[model samples]
Target chain A: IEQPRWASKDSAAGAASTPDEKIVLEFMDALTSNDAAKLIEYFAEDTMYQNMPLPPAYGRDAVEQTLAGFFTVVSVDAVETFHIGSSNGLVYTERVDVLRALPTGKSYNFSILGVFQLTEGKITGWRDYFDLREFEEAVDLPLRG
Target chain B: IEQPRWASKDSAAGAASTPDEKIVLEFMDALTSNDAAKLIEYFAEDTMYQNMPLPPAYGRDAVEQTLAGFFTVVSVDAVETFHIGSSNGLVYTERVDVLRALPTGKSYNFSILGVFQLTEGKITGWRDYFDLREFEEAVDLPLR
Candidate 1:
């Protein structure tokens, strides 16, 4: 992993080291690969994945199932990270994710803030925050009037 | 500023020390005070404030004007921070801001992720990300 020279070392919990940042980046890579089986390996058995405002999925199995559902409609092309930092044992990522819709092949992009918690080299908790309305509009699926 | 026990010290550029974190906290405190004049003091002359999805307001004067508009309807009760960290002179805050609307006295809450870049103890850049729809629903003002 190429470390950004401008990255900060001031951490309240010790600091989220390079290795912790690597784990989350690798997970992002796994996501782009679109393999649910491989992606689940990065998560702990009791991991919780919260896609903010939406209900959270608990456990590795449930998280994998949720990812699988997402993989059905769109294939992630890239997760372009703008900035990333860590504090305590948690990693924070600011990114713009690009994806292509299945069959139609239309492209969509969404800005996201992802917070990850890792323990024993496994991601224990992952929460993604973004505008649900923006996503719905991009995908042409309005959940509300 | 009360330091978090679990806060990490693994900074890449150099750790964001206690004073850096304190500046952002004080800024949050100023927001809750509902004084646009006081809040503007935290920003530098050329500061850029972006309330994501909306066009950014440039310079301290513009930022204060935008904030003043917000102050007209709601009074901020608290900025309850969930997690805060800094790196490379930038601070990141995960928080739920509580506010009460004037006249009608209705309460509203919104979750936010705020990114701040400080230069020479003054905020040079500030960006807040949140769901616009959620904010509209909370305040009964739709900008769509």
Candidate 2:
């Protein structure tokens, strides 16, 4: 298999150099493709998936289920070109998740900013922020139901 | 109501030394107390809320409506201590939400992390992150 450029570097250098923008850009691309396994592999076991409206999940099962739950809920088609900014140890990206729903029969879209902590090649942890109402109205989510 | 010990110059002075932590902590404390007026007062009118699930509302209406929306979904009975760390102008806090829902007969027990930007003791913008599956289960939301 042809490994991505990131595979050759040690964690410290990956951490040393800010490679988050490209990594996130690739991660979301995998998301749009619905490549769940590949996406799940990027997470560190015991890694945390912190989304509002839900409590935190433990381990890969929780993270996978958390993501799969979304794929089940509706559909996710992310449109992300690269927008990267780096600090001493963190990399952040500005991306958007455009969504479509089957149950509610509607669609929604929202912009998100993700901050990632990279140690070597794997994403040790990550955090994303966006507007909830924009998400609800975008996909017409039923807040009550 | 008695003012918080923070109102004392000494406490405020000591806490403010950390800059970002004090701001994030105070903002949330105001929220749990249902002090909307005070919360908004701390927000910059041009401030923005990012990384949430809604569109940017812009200005005070945006602030009020967002707060109203939050009250619509759940109410916080308490906010356990939050851990904060900062670099440059950015601040991040990992928090546990201890809340109860009103009409839905639900509960939200969760951990979330927030990243924010501050200026002059006010939150100018920020993003929120949490787990959706945990939230759904907490609210007894059926599988989608």
Candidate 3:
């Protein structure tokens, strides 16, 4: 598949000094550009993705399938990051994820706190925390005709 | 029961350098002291406590109640913080929480990632993420 238009515009350089930071930024880039194939590259064979309180998405296939579903229905409109720190083989991120429905453009903003563990420059574990109620409201918003 | 002798000696000063950093350190002090009363002092009345994948604890009373339950069964043995960073009203922490069971004296180490939001020097929102499975394993391990 061809790369998205905003693919080359991606730069995690400011926070990309470390390899894991680069991986996270790239993952963010993939999420933004709707590039599921590129996104799965950063994960190890058995990466664990837990978006708190929900059943975890295990391995690259599980993760990719989950991301693919989101990509099919919603798009990243904006991302306001508060902090991104990496040390001791883990990367921590605090940000607000802004998303819009693909068909109707119904949009909402929600906060996320994510922790990623990297081994050999590949993400082995990913856990994200956010308000379940807030996300539920966003997801249930009425779609535009 | 008498308060632990080490409770009064807790300090977050050595690890704290900024105003917000100091707030987090104080919170850590409360945790180290296993003082739920002291812990609630650092939070806003309506502050939220989220321990990922479980139900959230809202407001000071709920937060206090939740912490009190943990404090009753588990006590802090030591805390090894790997990193702490703050910006834009948010503080990020990565550390290993060394906990000792009150009855058996068993101890285990588990990793935690904390995100805190402060308003007027009080924590307004607190969220911590860790491996639920890993925590369960640590809690069930035989005494060391």
Evaluating just chain A, the predictions reach TM-scores of: 0.81, 0.71, 0.77
DockQ of predicted model 3 = 0.06
Question: Which rank order by TM-score, best down to worst?
Answer: 1, 2, 3
lDDT of 2 by residue, B55-87 (tens): 454566687666666565667766654345554
Residues forming the 10-long window of minimal summed lDDT in candidate 1 chain B: B4-13
* Candidate 2 ranges with C-alpha deviation above 4 Å: A1-17, A20-22, A36-76, A81-94, A99-115, A126-145, B1-18, B49-51, B61-75, B81-88, B101-107, B110-113, B126-144
User: Which candidate leads in DockQ?
Assistant: 1
Per-residue accuracy of model 2 over A1-145 as CA lDDT, tens digit each = 1221212122222233335545755676677766567689888764665444334555677788767766666677555432344443455544556777757767665555555656575666566655454455544334431
What DockQ would you assign to candidate 2? 0.09
Q: On a 0 to 1 DockQ scale, where is model 1?
A: 0.30
| Per-residue error (Å), model 3, residue A138 | 3.4
Q: What CAPRI grade goes to candidate 2?
A: incorrect
Q: Which ranges in model 3 have alpha carbons more than 4 Å from their true place?
A: A1-16, A140-145, B1-37, B40-113, B116-144
Q: lDDT per model, in order?
A: 0.71, 0.56, 0.65
Sorted on lDDT, best first, the list reads 1, 3, 2
lDDT of 2 at A9: 27
**Candidate 3, overall lDDT?**
0.65
Task: Between candidates 2 and 3, name the one with more favorable DockQ.
Answer: 2
Task: Indicate the worst ten consecutive residues by lDDT in candidate 1 chain A.
Answer: A4-13
Quote the lDDT for A127 in model 3.
76
